[PDB]
């Protein structure tokens, strides 16, 4: 059973469980508000019984360690964590318009300026992480959250890692990323370049309204990733289709860096809206 | 010197040596493909000079005799054997994802459903053997092979024996099993129950990411087996830990039969994936704690 009111022995601050938001994988997530301040946050409550298997205790510890060290306006605000004997409580920024998964599911393909709007904010968030020697390793629609004003906030640092030294490549992952990069598939070792691959996969989905490689069965899906088999519809704009091709390459070193990515003709020469209307979640907007 | 093309005087069928797979104990193993069919197999090429010591000639002959009599979808396909003056050539099913040893070495401990996934297939393979009065006597990660689709195929029948009548107990082994059962250690005589012991040792390793009894030196390892000294981490699920305790008992008669084993709450009440993704060989997959079969 989960307590109605969540108490923090450390800072003597206490919260009240609100509406059920859903299961964040291994977690049970609710709206919460501080007893005194009345400020609303997104609680992430993990059974400590599931954090008994060390392999899972490791993941949880690293997630909080990387996320609590990060403050950027396109990264989910980490507002603290604490635990009792039964649960671990993680207090995060509440993003009132959920994630790009919900948008994608409602809207399918977006307009090119909408695609561009969200993608710049994602790249900006990701450029901050990379600069702070952090690889997310699991960027997907589901963990790219939208605040009230449809500002993109990168969250879910479950599979994220910290690069210790210049040149480091990683092998081991405490979980299976949504978008498997070729160098993760082949277990070749990987670095920052995995994040560019997923942004390429994310860019494709936003413009095409379907994932690039995903098929009925996983065996064909992974074979397509291995041989770099995908088709960009003839209806996609050249410049954008070019930037997708640049990102979705078998060779990690061949892909743009997050810094080069942001300076693509797609971003520099294309129209970026300053603000999107809230109708964009359900109906395609007019720009012209 | 090993011939580039392997010729069979009997059936006039001929093969071409492919990539080197590795040394299968006493053997030298390669990919091979038939000249006409172009079908790819796993060759096992034994120097006949090593099959000169009778004790070794006996093993080899019995291995081929037991294995060539067996056909099951969780047993390595035996596709024939032949010899020249220098070598004995054994043609087996090619399992393109090697063995559980490679998985274990990469992944260490697996998720409980992964453990369950492989274990059901192992028990099924072993239930077929037992039904055909065959004790494997050397089940280990290294000889539990994985085909393209991650189906488990039991191979390596080097220490395997044929039970002549029901109730018969055996003593002599022309080799040392990876997982020594207590009744083999004490030379008390043994039967089908040894195979359950190794599955218990295999189950433990898959869930814990380390062997139950193995230590630095062998003297302590064998003393632990003799006294039944092992510890199940507090993090293992009760039902699974219970089934391990049932299998890893000093008394062979106390252990489940391969038929009772398959019907354990671990298997019947636990979630079994129908298929694993190929990423499972390198990265742990995520499973819902509520995995119902009433949604996509
Ligand atoms: C805390 C975990 C994770 C995260 O990390 N952050 C940062 C987050 C920030 N903000 C939200 N916000 C909302 C999330 C879901 C909903 C929503 O509409 N929930 C309905 C509940 C009833 N159900 C039948 C249908 C869905 C509303 C949200 O804003 C109020 N969710 C977040 N999640 C998600 C929490 C559920 C999965 C993951
Ligand atoms: C025939 C002996 C025995 C057996 O009985 N069967 C049935 C078997 C079926 N299939 C395989 N398949 C493969 C085994 C290894 C590899 C592999 O990746 N080998 C690498 C070669 C390069 N080297 C630097 C590192 C090792 C690939 C395989 O499939 C393509 N091996 C089998 N073995 C094993 C063969 C040596 C140990 C035992």
Curated annotation (Swiss-Prot), chain A:
Changing residue 44 to M: Loss of kinase activity. No effect on S-phase progression. The chain holds residues 39 to 326 of 603 of the full protein. This is Serine/threonine-protein kinase PLK1. The modification Phosphothreonine is found at residues 172, 176. Transmembrane segments: none annotated. It is found in: Nucleus; Chromosome, Centromere, Kinetochore; Cytoplasm, Cytoskeleton, Microtubule organizing center, Centrosome; Cytoplasm, Cytoskeleton, Spindle. It is linked to Defects in PLK1 are associated with some cancers, such as gastric, thyroid or B-cell lymphomas. Expression is cancer increased in tumor tissues with a poor prognosis, suggesting a role in malignant transformations and carcinogenesis. Serine/threonine-protein kinase that performs several important functions throughout M phase of the cell cycle, including the regulation of centrosome maturation and spindle assembly, the removal of cohesins from chromosome arms, the inactivation of anaphase-promoting complex/cyclosome (APC/C) inhibitors, and the regulation of mitotic exit and cytokinesis. Polo-like kinase proteins act by binding and phosphorylating proteins that are already phosphorylated on a specific motif recognized by the POLO box domains. Keywords: Acetylation, ATP-binding, Cell cycle, Cell division, Centromere, Chromosome, Cytoplasm, Cytoskeleton, Isopeptide bond, Kinase, Kinetochore, Mitosis, Nucleotide-binding, Nucleus, Phosphoprotein, Repeat, Serine/threonine-protein kinase, Transferase, Ubl conjugation. Induction: By growth-stimulating agents. Belongs to the protein kinase superfamily. Ser/Thr protein kinase family. CDC5/Polo subfamily. One of its GO terms (biological process) is microtubule bundle formation. The active site is at 138 (proton acceptor). Residues 156-183 are annotated as: Activation loop. ATP binds at residues 21-29, 44, 93, 140-143, 156. The keyword Cytoplasm applies. It comes from Homo sapiens (Human). Placenta and colon. Interacts with CEP170. Interacts with EVI5. Interacts with FAM29A. Interacts with SLX4/BTBD12. Interacts with TTDN1. Interacts (via POLO-box domain) with the phosphorylated form of BUB1, CDC25C and CENPU. Interacts with KIF2A. Interacts with CYLD. Part of an astrin (SPAG5)-kinastrin (SKAP) complex containing KNSTRN, SPAG5, PLK1, DYNLL1 and SGO2. Interacts with BIRC6/bruce. Interacts with CDK1-phosphorylated FRY; this interaction occurs in mitotic cells, but not in interphase cells. FRY interaction facilitates AURKA-mediated PLK1 phosphorylation. The POLO box domains act as phosphopeptide-binding module that recognizes and binds serine-[phosphothreonine/phosphoserine]-(proline/X) motifs. PLK1 recognizes and binds docking proteins that are already phosphorylated on these motifs, and then phosphorylates them. PLK1 can also create its own docking sites by mediating phosphorylation of serine-[phosphothreonine/phosphoserine]-(proline/X) motifs subsequently recognized by the POLO box domains. The modification Phosphoserine is found at residues 65, 99, 231. Changing residue 172 to V: Reduced catalytic activity, but no effect on affinity for ATP.
């Amino acid at each position: 059973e989960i307590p109605e009111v969540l108490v923090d022995p450390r800072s003597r601050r206490r919260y009240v469980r609100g509406r059920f938001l859903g299961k964040g994988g291994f977690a049970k997530c609710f709206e919460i508000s501080d007893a005194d301040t009345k400020e609303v946050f997104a609680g992430k409550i993990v059974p400590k019984s599931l954090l008994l298997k060390p392999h899972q205790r490791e993941k949880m510890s690293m997630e909080i360690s990387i996320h609590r060290s990060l403050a950027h306006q396109h990264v989910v605000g980490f507002h603290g964590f604490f635990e009792d004997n039964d649960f671990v409580f993680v207090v995060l920024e509440l993003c009132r318009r959920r994630s790009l998964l919900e948008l994608h599911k409602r809207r399918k393909a977006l307009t090119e300026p909408e695609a561009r709007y969200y993608l710049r904010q994602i790249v900006l968030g990701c450029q901050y992480l990379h600069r702070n020697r952090v690889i997310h390793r699991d960027l997907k629609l589901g963990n790219l959250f939208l605040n009230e004003d449809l500002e993109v906030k990168i969250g879910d640092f479950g599979l994220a890692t910290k690069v210790e030294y210049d040149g480091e490549r990683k092998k081991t992952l405490c979980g299976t990323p949504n978008y498997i990069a070729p160098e993760v598939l082949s277990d070749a070792g990987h670095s920052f370049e995995v994040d560019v691959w997923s942004i390429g996969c994310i860019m494709y989905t936003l413009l095409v309204g379907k994932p690039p490689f995903e098929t009925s069965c996983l065996k064909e899906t992974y074979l397509r990733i291995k041989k770099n088999e995908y088709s960009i519809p003839k209806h996609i704009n050249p410049v954008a289709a070019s930037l997708i091709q640049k990102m979705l390459q078998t060779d990690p070193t061949a892909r743009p860096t997050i810094n080069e990515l942001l300076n693509d003709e797609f971003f520099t020469s294309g129209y970026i809206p300053a603000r999107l209307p809230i109708t964009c979640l359900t109906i395609p907007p007019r720009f012209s």
